[PDB]
Ligand binder design. Structure first.
Ligand SMILES: NC(=O)C1=CN([C@@H]2O[C@H](COP(=O)(O)OP(=O)(O)OC[C@H]3O[C@@H](n4cnc5c(N)ncnc54)[C@H](OP(=O)(O)O)[C@@H]3O)[C@@H](O)[C@H]2O)C=CC1
Ligand SMILES: NC(=O)C1=CN([C@@H]2O[C@H](COP(=O)(O)OP(=O)(O)OC[C@H]3O[C@@H](n4cnc5c(N)ncnc54)[C@H](OP(=O)(O)O)[C@@H]3O)[C@@H](O)[C@H]2O)C=CC1
Lengths: 216, 216
């Protein structure tokens, strides 16, 4: 199948591009940095150099799936982009069969033993932390997705830690932070890539959100 | 000031353009039908012939305010456009002073006396009505707007009925359906235009939603 990867030059994105190619899919890497694309993805990966917010329906009409691996640096003040990229992507998928996987945040997950997103219980002081702006808008991105019953979107949240690393295996859940045998909560970029491509090839979480951690 | 009107050729839109011109503002009417613009707005009103979803930041950077007067016909299945047009517009207003007024729906208002949006209480049968699709997505549009604490958006809901007619005066509320001395709930296209231009000239409802009905 043909897969457009938004944020293809990123940590999650580049891992997704590699896993996609391993699995025999045609990749279109949407990028702003051709050099980064040449170095991280390889000369052989097809490229569309365009601002994500300016992508059109035509840009996406040859593709069977889209993966949103875009992010926003902490302390930029531009956490709203998490939301804007997603709303824009959804707007291009109206009346289309196209699968769209969105990587979400950990803050929209429940703590173990809770029944609601942990961000709701954050202290007022949290808004002063550089990570909050992005966490808030990814929580909103998650809520926005649920407004769309007629688009083939899939949400996947990382565990608390999202380090770079090769794939091994992953364990999946629904809305609650997962903790492994080591008492920690982490997923590698490689294992997130496995989970994403797994859903693309066999969608089980359409219009739902899952969370993934590294297996033990 | 310079005001861009989306849905300028519509019932609400054309009334808004008129009131804007009466009040000495420069109007940019975003339209898809030039002949309709010529007939309803006048040879004298500047036009931008473009799909709202492809409007750019540059299109809007001379404007001081934008008014969303777009709608979707009943039974089209395209009620999602209420949301898509609003999410696109918001994306263009990031880090700008520009005032954006969004005409919302009555379904996100409480019935007189209730403490919650009336749509939450609709029976299951409601979803079979041709008005529901649009109503649902305008409730979502209202919710989406509240995700955006750093944009100068203003929400205005009509009363239950939104007939064409000239301005007289209006009465404003917050989140509850308003009923006049006739026992009815209605606002004319002309009175909505008064309310919108009032907010543009003296914003009192920034990042808030008001409701308006025709005065007695
Ligand atoms: N524990 C958790 O919940 C956390 C969740 N995550 C999430 O995972 C996802 C992927 O994260 P990650 O792989 O580390 O991110 P990266 O920081 O590696 O960069 C992601 C992509 O975003 C692109 N990009 C960033 N800003 C813009 C913009 N303004 N215009 C255009 N493109 C842009 C970058 O382009 P370029 O390469 O050219 O710079 C890059 O390709 C995100 O949703 C992030 O929030 C990440 C960390 C942990
Ligand atoms: N009780 C309530 O909640 C109700 C709420 N309303 C709301 O009032 C607002 C204005 O409604 P109203 O003035 O009567 O609407 P109209 O139906 O008169 O006009 C709709 C405007 O949208 C434009 N438009 C429609 N479809 C598209 C499209 N697919 N692409 C581009 N432009 C498009 C039309 O262009 P064109 O002229 O070329 O067709 C027109 O300018 C809306 O938000 C509507 O939901 C209205 C009635 C009551």
């Amino acid at each position: 199948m043909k897969i457009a990867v938004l944020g293809a030059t990123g940590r999650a994105g580049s891992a997704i591009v590699a896993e996609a190619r391993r699995r025999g899919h045609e990749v279109l890497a949407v990028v702003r940095d051709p050099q980064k694309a040449a170095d991280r993805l390889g000369a052989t990966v097809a490229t569309l150099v365009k601002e994500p917010l300016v992508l059109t329906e035509a840009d996406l009409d040859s593709v069977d799936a889209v993966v949103d691996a875009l992010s926003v640096p902490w302390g930029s003040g531009r956490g709203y982009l998490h939301l804007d990229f997603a709303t824009h992507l959804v707007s291009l998928l109206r009346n289309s069969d196209t699968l769209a996987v969105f990587i979400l945040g950990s803050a929209s997950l429940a703590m173990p033993g809770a029944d609601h997103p942990m961000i709701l219980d954050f202290p007022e002081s949290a808004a002063s932390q550089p990570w909050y702006d992005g966490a808030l808008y990814q929580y909103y991105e998650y809520q926005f997705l649920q407004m769309n019953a007629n688009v083939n979107w899939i949400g996947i949240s990382p565990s608390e830690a999202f380090p770079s690393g090769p794939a091994t295996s992953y364990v999946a859940g629904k809305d609650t932070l997962l903790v492994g045998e080591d008492g920690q909560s982490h997923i590698t970029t490689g294992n997130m890539a496995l989970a994403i491509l797994d859903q693309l090839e066999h969608p089980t979480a359409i219009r739902d959100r899952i969370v993934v951690r590294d297996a033990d």
